Write a protein that binds this ligand. Structure first.
Ligand code: HEM
Ligand SMILES: COc1ccccc1O
Length: 293
């Protein structure tokens, strides 16, 4: 008994319209560069794209990126979403400038733009998510716990139709930002200061000396002498031997990681959506840098 959500292109819009929205996001990312101690809005936008998509349930096609339901009270007030209001607030003037783009399209695009502007891989992106009403908003509790093991992570991701390679690729987005004690009960960055997407998540897991410590919220997290941290679920990826092999593969091949992340992150953002046979192809946006902007 799955819902069907057919992508419907915003009327009359083409690649050049979405490139403009991409440019607006990217220009503001450049501009509001002080946010979160000069980290900027990139990681919170990537987290917003993931959380608005990762409520999906493959079994009945509820949740997912299609409806743009984060805009409603129940979803924005999810404890799992604590802090994401910042990303929503970043995107408000973009929505105000381009009132024609659906919410789900703007949520998902914000993540694609962040990744790409941080010099991550090109993520192909398709339009046509259509806003759905308040009673389509998924219930809280569909996003994953951080305090769990490899078995939990494996099972969890099966609901999002993600296999081991995809799960390991996705998680490497943790290299981007940091946990904030007030949002999640975890504190610190996964890696070095940076304004670039890399494969450092996998390098850190493997090369840092990790100690299992209690943070100020009385929760365990793996801490390193460099000031980095790993969630129990992150650390689970080197405790499970199947995960471990993939961690090593990406730690040793930046291009492989980029390609697999791009594919998985696009799949994540597209789960639950039926695209017509005559839907446009995915768009690959140029970065500001490739445009000389
Ligand atoms: C088992 C899976 C996962 C768990 C338990 C988890 C949990 C968390 C937690 C607790 C935070 C810190 C929240 C805060 O305090 O601000 C965080 C941040 C973040 N997450 Fe994950 N996450 C998971 C998977 C993913 C995936 C699949 C992606 C995207 C591909 C992702 C992207 C991010 C990013 C970019 C941040 C940094 C946000 C910021 O710097 O403000 N995570 N995650
Ligand atoms: C409901 O309006 C919005 C949708 C997506 C991003 C920012 C907004 O203000």
């Amino acid at each position: 008994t799955p819902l069907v959500h057919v992508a419907s292109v915003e009327k009359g819009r083409s690649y050049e319209d979405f490139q403009k929205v991409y440019n607006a996001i990217a220009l503001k990312l450049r501009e509001d560069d002080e946010y979160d101690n000069a980290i900027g809005y990139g990681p919170v936008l990537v987290r917003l794209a993931w959380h608005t998509s990762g409520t999906w349930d493959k079994h009945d096609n509820t949740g997912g990126s299609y409806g743009g339901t984060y805009r409603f009270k129940k979803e924005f007030n999810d404890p799992s979403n604590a802090g994401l209001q910042n990303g929503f607030k970043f995107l408000e003037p973009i929505h105000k400038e381009f009132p024609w783009i659906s919410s789900g399209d703007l949520f998902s695009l914000g993540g694609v733009t962040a990744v790409q502007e941080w010099q991550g891989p090109k993520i192909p992106w398709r339009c046509g998510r259509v806003d759905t009403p308040e009673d389509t908003t998924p219930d809280n509790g569909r996003l994953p716990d951080a305090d769990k093991d490899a078995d939990y992570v494996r099972t969890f991701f099966q609901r999002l139709n993600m296999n081991d390679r995809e799960v390991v690729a996705l998680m490497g987005a943790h290299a981007l930002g940091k946990t904030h004690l007030k949002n999640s009960g975890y504190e610190g960055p996964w890696g070095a200061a940076n304004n670039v997407f890399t494969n450092e998540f996998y390098l850190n897991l493997l090369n840092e000396d990790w100690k299992l410590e209690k943070n100020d919220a009385n929760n365990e997290q793996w801490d390193s002498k460099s000031g980095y941290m790993m969630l129990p679920t992150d650390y689970s990826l080197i405790q499970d031997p199947k995960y471990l092999s993939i961690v090593k593969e990406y730690a040793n091949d930046q291009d492989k990681f980029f390609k697999d992340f791009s594919k998985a992150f696009e799949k994540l953002l597209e789960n639950g959506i039926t695209f017509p046979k005559d839907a446009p192809s995915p768009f690959i946006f140029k970065t500001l840098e490739e445009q000389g902007l």
